[PDB]
Structures are given as structure tokens and as C-alpha cells.
Amino acid sequence: MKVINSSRKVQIPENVTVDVKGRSVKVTGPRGTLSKSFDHASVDINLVGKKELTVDLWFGNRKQIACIKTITSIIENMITGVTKGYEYKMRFVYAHFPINVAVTDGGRVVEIRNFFGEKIVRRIELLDGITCYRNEKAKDEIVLTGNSLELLSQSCATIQLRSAIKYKDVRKFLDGIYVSERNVL
Amino acid sequence: GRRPARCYRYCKNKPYIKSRYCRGVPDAKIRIFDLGRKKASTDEFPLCVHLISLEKEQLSSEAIEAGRISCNKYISKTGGKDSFHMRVRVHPWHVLRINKMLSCAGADRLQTGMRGAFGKPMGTVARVNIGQIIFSIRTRDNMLANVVEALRRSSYKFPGRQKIVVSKKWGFTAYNREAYQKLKADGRLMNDGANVKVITNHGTLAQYAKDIAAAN
Amino acid sequence: IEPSLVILARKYKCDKMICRKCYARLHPRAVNCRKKKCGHSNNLRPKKKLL
Amino acid sequence: MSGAGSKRKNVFIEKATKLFTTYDKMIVAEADFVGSSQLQKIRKSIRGIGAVLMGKKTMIRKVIRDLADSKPELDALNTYLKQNTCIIFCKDNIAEVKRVINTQRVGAPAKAGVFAPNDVIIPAGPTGMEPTQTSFLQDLKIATKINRGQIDIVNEVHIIKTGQKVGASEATLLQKLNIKPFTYGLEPKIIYDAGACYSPSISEE
RNA sequence: CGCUCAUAGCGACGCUGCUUUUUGAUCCUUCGAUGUCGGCUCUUCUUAUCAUUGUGAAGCAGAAUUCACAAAGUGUUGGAUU
RNA sequence: AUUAGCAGUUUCGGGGGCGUAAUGCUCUCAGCUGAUUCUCAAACUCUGAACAUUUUUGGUAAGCAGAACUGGCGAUGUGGGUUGAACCAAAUAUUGGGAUAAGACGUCUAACAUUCACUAAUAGAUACCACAAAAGGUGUUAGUUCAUUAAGACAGCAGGACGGUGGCCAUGGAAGUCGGUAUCCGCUAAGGAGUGUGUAACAACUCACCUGCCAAAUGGACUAGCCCUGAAAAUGGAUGA
């Protein structure tokens, strides 16, 4: 069975304006522009005047019905990133070796030396909307911040993945840089 | 050890019993058959939970005994013995044969290779048909969850597909549950121990009142 | 060493639920191996702890 | 359908529609954080004078009682759409019930997601802070200012009421500190009468 | 069994398969002839992986070891007896 | 060939209890007898039909050995099954026209359109025939049955989760939470003498069950279509491409 019609509705706040042209949604907010294509769907993305945006699908079954909530929530992510963009908090846990962290803002990169006493320097660039800075207030914590969730959480996941103990017992050591908080404002 | 039971799985031979002519056949691996309380009166256990075979084959005696132990052990752990009474509704009468040949590296010299090929008896086997009950359990109605899991536990010792039905009869009888209840409440039932005997209309030609004063 | 950091670090690489065919980490509320080698099998145990 | 399953409502409705027409003056309460430790020490005082009776939104089965009684479930104040209630019924002490029912309260720290009563004060100041527990409060979004020699933000005025959830990071600031500013418990909303409202005013005393 | 704990690792009692690197079974080709053991030599293929690379599990604290996956790209010895 | 009890004898052969002791009363317990009960056989029968497919013996099996009926190959091509001694169609003088048979109809390759589902795997695609199983899947499609809900459902987020009592027992210590046994009460909408984590045992967190926001369908145990795991072999590779 494929249902005749299955829509959703996305509510545009008044300071945000979407510019959609054939499954190519482009929000514009006060703090920054954001865009994503949804050309991998048989979907008519379509806005109702100024306040609404209605993802629709005619005769979808499943693997297609399941995608309209996905591409509704991704447009909602693009909207929330351009009103009050996401800010992730990442904390250092170590057993004995204090993890040092460098940050410049050329490509806004992070450099992680003295991780487990390794002398390799873990220089890692951030995805191209993202900056980061150390927390002077709370000890041993770097807060990430950005405009898109798929860039910010992926940058955080690359910091977290590249901060592992290899060739050992991962249940004991637990030295790394993990995502603690996932706030918005 | 024993040859793989994929040889003796399907019944392609004429049936071949221990008799005057099949002399020295070894015994069956299933020694005891009926397990549980089994001094239980048939009013006690109303639930007939079966295990029928979906394909016809030769369920080996070595397989019936392993399934028997697997069914006994799980209910004895679950609710203790005497909470059930199962028989086993299949007996290993067909005996298998093996034209045994040597595992020697120079085996051309010794064994009559396919000369006088008629094998010597190994084991026994039970020739189940499709829809033939092999494990019938009689138990209380508070064990419909557990004895089906024990018959599922015994379905993996048996070759292929077994189906656990919950029978619509009073348990090891011929009459249905409301029909046994009619035959008890109307007074046409008796107490032969673990089975009934119905006061029929057949000795009612002069008298039948020897059955009336001892009715269930 | 703060206990909350140990709880956070066990949240990410210790509190898993490893499939039995697929020795493969899943989230702690899983019921099925997400991979083809398992057969999407619904047979899985927690990751064992330390003392 | 209805009237089935475990802990049946057809054996509760014998209390939820029958003894709800034998009473004079009642207290619409608040059971949003009230214990069973604090409840067993108030359900022995009411037990001699009345009862502690509520079906909890089964009470729209009271619509058949409103033929001649004209009892409101939605026409009075606090229209019963956003909260939990356990209304207090009395036969002997319909009058001096408001004094033992507002004595046995205990002050305690709140948690995350609690229903946030009308008197909540955030632990702040020099006595409401340690120099070691600053780094937890230094984790949050709000930047701090130096007032009376302490890394702290001051908020002693009421900002939250019933119907707004408390943030998750604010719970440990009440739990770890010994600061328990308000003694909370049962909260009377409306003084209800058999078909009308006796007192349409609040009285926490 | 693994102190407790079926399934870290195993795993009886049973059952279901695969392989053609053992030996049988058979006699279809070949008896106007396919030179038949082993070794030396040399190349290529297989993966049912010993090591190496990346990973995941453990009764993986470190070290050592054990189970599995993607993996056949590259290795996989000198000798006494016969 | 053979399983299990119930009854009668039952005193008996043996054990004992019972009148103070015995072929004296009763119980498993043996044994004899009766009405039942499970499976039953090529060499059993009251009754009892109508190389290839089928019946069929030895063999674990065979493209093995041996039989019976029928049809073939041998003797025989032709059209099809890519290919081919036996399969399907159909039998051969030399040919023309037409319609066909098995088989097919994207291209090789002569021959098509319309229509409804299923498959999302590098799968699958002409019986013999060139393989695949047990056991699995919260892959999807169809279905069966049972239960829940406007007496407010599942799910999410939160509030409660109390006393007698730390139940009896047992012991350095065992208090809900190492174990043998019971499992009722007060107060309520709702409490296991506790589903767990931990501890000198507690404490503390936690689940059962109820309730708050919410707004409408929810949950389970199966069934069997396709598909996936099971599924590893040597030259390079075969739905014929």
C-alpha cells in the first residue's frame, strides 16, 4: 500500500526567508545563509506564502514516506541554525596525561597534542562554517559553535574519533574529547 | 561413532523390524517413554500440547531420546516434575543397516566391496509421517507457555520442521474440552486412572448400574 | 578524576551492546545487529564491564 | 475497549462517582511533587474528618452526576488542562482543614522537569555558593559577574511559575547546595462547593 | 564447563550442511600404451588467514595470549634420521 | 513385537504400620486376572480397493548394481531445451503456399502491445539440468488471531514508589536487592516483605504499578511470498552472451 498523500509542514519564523527552487531549499537568516539540496527525493518542496513550507509526497509507500519527515527535520535544522545556531560543548577526560589543545582561526582548526602522551600532533580542520574556542571558565573543555548541525556535529565527531586509545583496552583508559552538551542558545 | 543421520533421514526402504529374522539388532537409545506424574487422573491435566512432524522421515531413536531429555529438563527446571505428563507418540521399530567397510589405506584387499552388501543392524529408527504426533504433552492450563517452549527445545534435536499445536481435546483422549465437560457433568464418565471410559449404550441390554455408582 | 567524565566516556565507547555473531558495537537500546554479516540477528549481549 | 485490564477503573468508579455527592466544602489541591512519605503524614489527619479522593481525569465520568447537581468540571477556575490534582474532601472539619494541610510541608531541592511551583528561588549569593562548585556553574551559557567577591549570577526574584519546565543544569545547583529556600507541599487552588465555588480566592495559609 | 555467568572462550546429548587436499565405492574413458612414488626446480591459482595492514570483541589493567571481520597485496626458513 | 497406569486378588514373596504375637486389617510392592492405553511388521492379518516417468531391492550414495509396465536411444534425423544419444514437440521421398506444435517474442535471434503487484539483493531469469539445507532477520508486501484505548492507550518528558518491617530463618557483617520458606495489612489512583546497580549492610540511583502534558489508534504471537545471513577452492567466466 502506498498512501495517496503524506505531507508535513515547516513553520518559518518571521526573520528567516526560504528561497526554494525545485528541491533546493535555501534559508536566509539574520546570522547567516544556509542551503541544502534534496534532489534525492520525489518530493515537491513548496512554501505557503511566508510562514509555512510544506514538504509533500504523492503516492509514496515506505523508503519514500520515511523520507519526508527526514527532509522536514533537516530544513528545521537549517532554520534553527540561522536563528540561533547550535553550540556544542566538548570536554577532555584523561587519566594521567593532561591533554593540550591548540586553536587558530585560519581554517579555525584544532590541534591536540599530549593526548595519551603521544607525540603526534592531531591537527584537525573544521568543516566550512564552524569556529571553536576554549572555555576559560569551565576547566578542560572546548566549545564548538556554528551555523549548521551537519557541519558542527561532524566536526565534533571527527575530534572525538581522532582522540581514541588504540591497541589497548578501551573500557579502562577512556582518554578523549567527547561531546558533552548540545545547546542552541 | 555413528554415521551421519543424513544417510538414514528419509524412509526409502521397506519397514524392517526386530523379529525372528533380524536377529542380533542392538537396543533402542530411548529407554523410557512416558514421563511426568503419569499417576495423574485425567481430570487434573486438561491441556494437550503436541509436537507433530511436518515432513516424513526417519526420526532416529538417538534423536527421540535427546529431544525427550531436552523436554524433560526444561519443564523440571521450570515448574518441577508432576506438573505435566508426556508420553512420546513414536516408537523406533525400523532398524537401520550398515554395509561397513574398513577405513584402511589398503582396503581393496580385505573388504568384499559391494559383495554381499547386506548390512548388519545398527540402531533403530522411527518412521514418522507428515502430521504424525511424536511428542504429546498433557499438562495443566497454566503451562501453555512453558511446554510449548520445551517442545520448541525438542524441535531442534529432530530433523527438520516440527509444529507445536495446542490440541482442542482434554488431553490424551478423543473428546473435546467442552465435550469432556459434558461427558463429566452429565455423568457418563469413569475413573480408569489416567484415562476415561465412557458408559456406553451397549451393555445397557440388561444392566449397566455397575458403572453408575463409580462415575466421575 | 571527576566521575561525570568517566560516565561521559563510558557513554561513548563502553556502554554498548555487542552482537554475538558480529562482534560489533551497537547502541545500548538495540535489539538487532545493523549489519549484513549478522543476518540482522536479534542475538546480542552488553559490553562487559570492569571491576 | 474500556473497563478492562489490570487495576480496573470499574472498581475505582464506585468511589469516583458515588462518594463525590456526599460532601460540602472541598479543596482543589496540587499533587505535582508531593510524596508518599509526605502523603502518609497528611492522609492520617484527613482520614478522621474526610478523605483524599481523586480519580485523576477519570473525573469526566462525573458528567452523569451533573443532571440535578450542576457540578462543574470545566466551568470553574483552573479549567483542568495543564496540571495534576488530588482534591481534599471533608465531612467534619470543612473549616479548619487549611492549617494542618499547610503545615506538614518539607523544603527540599528540585530536579529537572518538575512542575515548578510559584515560589522557587535560585541558590545565589556568598552563602549560596562554594569556591569549588563554581566550575559547574562556570559550565553554563550565562557569563558571570563579580558581586561580593564570588563567581555568581544573582536571581532572587520569582521568574518561573506553574506551567514552565526548569532547565536540566539548574537541578544540581539546588541538589548539591544545602539551599532549600521554600517549604513546599500541597497547594490549594479553588475552594469548591457542591455546584458552585465557595471561596474563589487562593489561601496557602 | 567457565568461582557466580549457557553462548569471552567452549560446548555434551542431537540435528543440518559444505569441501574433494584422506581412504573407500564404482568401472564411464583409456590395455594396436596418457611413462606410475618422492625430491629438486619454476610459475600461477584458492582461502578454509600463520605473519603483516586496518578494525571489532575477551574472563583485553600493562605485557603476553584468545575469538572474529575486510583482507590472498607481500612473506611463509636452515638442518639430523628416513 | 511393545508403553503407561487404574481396579480385583489385595492376608500373599519382601518391607513395614495396625489388635500386645500370626495367610489377620490396609499401602507402594511383586506376581495372576479383567476393562483401558502408546507405537505397530518384507518373511502378520478380520477386512481390502485402482536411458526416462512410475513401481522397485542392495547400497550412506552414485552418471552404482539389479528387476517390473510403458515409451524411447541403439536404428533417427528434424523444430526446441545455448550446448547435448535418450527430455518436450514430432517422426525423415523432392519442394511451394498457409496455419501451427514444443519453445519463445530488448539485441545476438525470426516474433508484441496493454495491465496488477512483489524484488532495491548484484540478486533473479526454460522442468530433466547442472545444486543447496537446518536455523535465523525490527528488509518489505500481503494475512491470521489475541489484547489495549476518550473509566485518557503504547511511546516520549516528569511526580510518587511510604509504614509495621530491617518478615521469618541462617552469620563478623546479609537491613528490598548472596541464599531455604512465606507472601497479609494500613493509606490511597499506586506499592514485590521487592526488576536491578552499588555498599561494613545500608544510603543513593533504579524497575514493577499509578498519575500529570499529549491527542488516536497502539501492542504482541504467528502465517508465508519475494529478498538478505547461513553460503569456502584452486586457469579467467558464464541466466548462452
PDB file of N, CA and C in Angstrom, chain C residues 10-30:
ATOM      1  N   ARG C  10      32.299   6.522  29.289  1.00  0.00           N
ATOM      2  CA  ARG C  10      31.690   5.212  29.142  1.00  0.00           C
ATOM      3  C   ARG C  10      30.428   5.258  28.305  1.00  0.00           C
ATOM      4  N   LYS C  11      29.775   6.418  28.222  1.00  0.00           N
ATOM      5  CA  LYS C  11      28.617   6.572  27.352  1.00  0.00           C
ATOM      6  C   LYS C  11      28.971   6.393  25.882  1.00  0.00           C
ATOM      7  N   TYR C  12      30.209   6.681  25.498  1.00  0.00           N
ATOM      8  CA  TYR C  12      30.559   6.730  24.090  1.00  0.00           C
ATOM      9  C   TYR C  12      31.321   5.517  23.589  1.00  0.00           C
ATOM     10  N   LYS C  13      32.084   4.824  24.433  1.00  0.00           N
ATOM     11  CA  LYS C  13      32.766   3.640  23.931  1.00  0.00           C
ATOM     12  C   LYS C  13      32.795   2.473  24.905  1.00  0.00           C
ATOM     13  N   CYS C  14      32.038   2.516  25.990  1.00  0.00           N
ATOM     14  CA  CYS C  14      31.914   1.351  26.851  1.00  0.00           C
ATOM     15  C   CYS C  14      30.486   0.861  26.978  1.00  0.00           C
ATOM     16  N   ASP C  15      29.517   1.763  27.118  1.00  0.00           N
ATOM     17  CA  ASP C  15      28.117   1.361  27.254  1.00  0.00           C
ATOM     18  C   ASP C  15      27.553   1.090  25.867  1.00  0.00           C
ATOM     19  N   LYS C  16      27.841  -0.099  25.374  1.00  0.00           N
ATOM     20  CA  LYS C  16      27.367  -0.547  24.080  1.00  0.00           C
ATOM     21  C   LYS C  16      26.595  -1.839  24.274  1.00  0.00           C
ATOM     22  N   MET C  17      26.282  -2.484  23.167  1.00  0.00           N
ATOM     23  CA  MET C  17      25.569  -3.749  23.206  1.00  0.00           C
ATOM     24  C   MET C  17      26.055  -4.537  21.995  1.00  0.00           C
ATOM     25  N   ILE C  18      27.003  -5.419  22.226  1.00  0.00           N
ATOM     26  CA  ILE C  18      27.736  -6.079  21.160  1.00  0.00           C
ATOM     27  C   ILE C  18      27.000  -7.330  20.712  1.00  0.00           C
ATOM     28  N   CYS C  19      26.763  -7.423  19.407  1.00  0.00           N
ATOM     29  CA  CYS C  19      26.166  -8.593  18.783  1.00  0.00           C
ATOM     30  C   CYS C  19      27.055  -9.817  18.943  1.00  0.00           C
ATOM     31  N   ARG C  20      26.445 -10.990  18.837  1.00  0.00           N
ATOM     32  CA  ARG C  20      27.177 -12.202  19.175  1.00  0.00           C
ATOM     33  C   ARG C  20      27.882 -12.807  17.977  1.00  0.00           C
ATOM     34  N   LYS C  21      27.256 -12.786  16.805  1.00  0.00           N
ATOM     35  CA  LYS C  21      27.975 -13.156  15.594  1.00  0.00           C
ATOM     36  C   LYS C  21      28.913 -12.039  15.176  1.00  0.00           C
ATOM     37  N   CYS C  22      28.344 -10.906  14.813  1.00  0.00           N
ATOM     38  CA  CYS C  22      29.066  -9.665  14.593  1.00  0.00           C
ATOM     39  C   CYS C  22      29.629  -9.141  15.893  1.00  0.00           C
ATOM     40  N   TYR C  23      30.920  -9.309  16.120  1.00  0.00           N
ATOM     41  CA  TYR C  23      31.494  -8.596  17.250  1.00  0.00           C
ATOM     42  C   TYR C  23      31.534  -7.128  16.865  1.00  0.00           C
ATOM     43  N   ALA C  24      30.454  -6.406  17.156  1.00  0.00           N
ATOM     44  CA  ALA C  24      30.235  -5.083  16.597  1.00  0.00           C
ATOM     45  C   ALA C  24      29.408  -4.254  17.560  1.00  0.00           C
ATOM     46  N   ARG C  25      29.871  -3.039  17.844  1.00  0.00           N
ATOM     47  CA  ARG C  25      29.232  -2.184  18.834  1.00  0.00           C
ATOM     48  C   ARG C  25      27.904  -1.654  18.323  1.00  0.00           C
ATOM     49  N   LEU C  26      26.866  -1.771  19.146  1.00  0.00           N
ATOM     50  CA  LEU C  26      25.588  -1.124  18.902  1.00  0.00           C
ATOM     51  C   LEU C  26      25.222  -0.277  20.109  1.00  0.00           C
ATOM     52  N   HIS C  27      24.242   0.598  19.918  1.00  0.00           N
ATOM     53  CA  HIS C  27      23.766   1.466  20.982  1.00  0.00           C
ATOM     54  C   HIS C  27      23.086   0.644  22.077  1.00  0.00           C
ATOM     55  N   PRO C  28      23.084   1.134  23.334  1.00  0.00           N
ATOM     56  CA  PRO C  28      22.618   0.296  24.449  1.00  0.00           C
ATOM     57  C   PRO C  28      21.127   0.006  24.513  1.00  0.00           C
ATOM     58  N   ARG C  29      20.339   0.499  23.571  1.00  0.00           N
ATOM     59  CA  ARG C  29      18.929   0.149  23.484  1.00  0.00           C
ATOM     60  C   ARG C  29      18.657  -0.571  22.162  1.00  0.00           C
ATOM     61  N   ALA C  30      19.615  -1.364  21.710  1.00  0.00           N
ATOM     62  CA  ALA C  30      19.452  -2.057  20.447  1.00  0.00           C
ATOM     63  C   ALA C  30      18.784  -3.398  20.657  1.00  0.00           C
TER      64      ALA C  30
END
